[PDB]
Amino acid sequence: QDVFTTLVDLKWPHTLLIFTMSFLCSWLLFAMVWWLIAFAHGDLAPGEGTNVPCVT
Amino acid sequence: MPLAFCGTENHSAAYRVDQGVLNNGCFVDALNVVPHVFLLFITFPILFIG
Numbered sequence: 001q002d003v004f005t006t007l008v009d010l011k012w013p014h015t016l017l018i019f020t021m022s023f024l025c026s027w028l029l030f031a032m033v034w035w036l037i038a039f040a041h042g043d044l045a046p047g048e049g050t051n052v053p054c055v056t
Numbered sequence: 057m058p059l060a061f062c063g064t065e066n067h068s069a070a071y072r073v074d075q076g077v078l079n080n081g082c083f084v085d086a087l088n089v090v091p092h093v094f095l096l097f098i099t100f101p102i103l104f105i106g
């Protein structure tokens with residue numbers, strides 16, 4: 001429960017693992033979501049048409 | 057011939073999500089991927105704090 005006590009307690013190499021993995025897990029999860037949604041709209045299919053993609 | 061989640065065969069024309077997105081023989085696979093990449097990246101910080 002006292003997570004933010006533990007995060008300060010941990011050593012610097014472990015703290016950098018948590019640092020790096022927090023950011024990268026967030027980046028990759030939201031990248032998955034962006035991939036899926038821009039695929040549902042069809043913007044991933046090459047040369048689909050003049051339909052304006054929801055993310056260029 | 058770059059990598060591809062679906063199959064690039066048929067001159068890379070299998071991504072057309074028409075006839076309903078859920079009827080895309082490849083997109084349903086992507087939906088099944090989502091829960092796994094959600095649990096991994098909501099638990100990794102907790103497992104690492106452990």
Ligand SMILES: CCCCCCCCCCCCCCCCCC(=O)OC[C@H](COP(=O)(O)OC[C@H](N)C(=O)O)OC(=O)CCCCCCCCCCCCCCCCC
Pocket residue numbers: 001003022025026029097098099101102
């Ligand atoms: C008598 C009255 C009692 C109270 C009644 C309240 C009634 C409320 C009704 C229900 C609403 C509750 C909603 C909670 C649902 C989620 C709970 C959750 O995740 O936290 C659960 C735990 C601890 O919290 P708790 O035990 O619930 O505390 C509340 C209570 N009062 C208590 O102290 O007992 O939390 C933790 O243990 C969190 C750990 C933090 C670690 C940091 C990383 C977070 C991981 C997720 C993100 C990772 C990073 C990646 C980013 C991805 C982006 C999606």
Ligand SMILES: CCCCCCCCCCCCCCCCCC(=O)OC[C@H](COP(=O)(O)OC[C@H](N)C(=O)O)OC(=O)CCCCCCCCCCCCCCCCC
Pocket residue numbers: 010011012013014016020
């Ligand atoms: C054999 C298994 C045993 C298991 C037991 C526990 C495991 C512990 C591992 C110990 C050895 C680790 C070697 C790491 C080499 C680099 C260390 C490093 O850069 O830190 C340099 C310093 C801190 O010094 P420290 O020796 O780490 O001190 C920790 C001490 N124990 C403490 O608690 O104080 O750091 C600082 O004082 C912070 C300065 C940061 C400035 C620049 C940032 C650099 C890193 C940025 C993040 C890069 C991430 C890249 C990820 C890429 C992914 C693709």
Ligand SMILES: *[C@@H]1O[C@H](CO)[C@@H](O[C@@H]2O[C@H](CO)[C@@H](O)[C@H](O)[C@H]2NC(C)=O)[C@H](O)[C@H]1NC(C)=O
Pocket residue numbers: 066069
């Ligand atoms: C492959 O994509 C094409 C166009 O989206 C469709 O069918 C192709 O076109 C020719 C000409 O009509 C057909 O004879 C073939 O069946 C397909 N070409 C090749 C090289 O297979 C159809 O949407 C897709 N067909 C298949 C079998 O995947």
